Amino acid sequence: XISXXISXAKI
Amino acid sequence: XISXXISXAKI
Amino acid sequence: XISXXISXAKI
Amino acid sequence: XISXXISXAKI
Amino acid sequence: XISXXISXAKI
Amino acid sequence: XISXXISXAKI
Amino acid sequence: XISXXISXAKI
Amino acid sequence: XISXXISXAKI
Ligand SMILES: [Cl-]
Ligand SMILES: [Cl-]
Ligand SMILES: [Cl-]
Ligand SMILES: [Cl-]
Ligand SMILES: [Cl-]
Ligand SMILES: [Cl-]
Ligand SMILES: [Cl-]
Ligand SMILES: [Cl-]
Ligand SMILES: [Cl-]
Ligand SMILES: [Cl-]
Ligand SMILES: [Cl-]
Ligand SMILES: [Cl-]
Ligand SMILES: [Cl-]
Ligand SMILES: [Cl-]
């Protein structure tokens, strides 16, 4: 589905 | 400065 | 002076 | 969702 | 400096 | 549903 | 700086 | 389905 998500580490 | 970046593996 | 800043780890 | 936030340690 | 942060309105 | 977002203008 | 960003319309 | 996509324009 949607994997990984968002933390701030990359964005 | 900028370290890392986007590969598609997470994003 | 300054210490830290914004890395993405918190923001 | 929201995780962490500003304390002063980094910011 | 680091001003405002989030309200929830956009995020 | 999903509303708002971030452009960089504010955040 | 940080521009473009995300609303869900594309991403 | 999923439309729009990641193009590199924003990400
Ligand atoms: Cl991220
Ligand atoms: Cl990284
Ligand atoms: Cl990535
Ligand atoms: Cl940070
Ligand atoms: Cl908080
Ligand atoms: Cl902090
Ligand atoms: Cl907000
Ligand atoms: Cl914004
Ligand atoms: Cl905007
Ligand atoms: Cl745009
Ligand atoms: Cl988008
Ligand atoms: Cl369109
Ligand atoms: Cl664009
Ligand atoms: Cl994109």
> In the block, which residue shows the tokens 């521009």?
G3
Tokens of A6: 């968002």
Residue B2 near residue G1 (C-beta atoms within 8 A): no
Cα-Cα end-to-end distance for chain H: 20
Q: What are the backbone angles phi and psi of residue G8, rounded to the nearest 5°?
A: 105, -25
* Integer Rg of chain G from CA: 8
Q: Resolution in A, one decimal?
A: 1.5
Task: Say yes or no: D9 contacts chain E, CB-CB below 8 A.
Answer: no
- Measured CA to CA, the distance from residue A11 to residue E1 in angstroms comes to 20
Task: Say yes or no: B6 contacts chain H, CB-CB below 8 A.
Answer: yes
- Measured CA to CA, the distance from residue D6 to residue C10 in angstroms comes to 7
- Measured CA to CA, the distance from residue C1 to residue H8 in angstroms comes to 37
What single-letter DSSP state applies at residue D10?
-
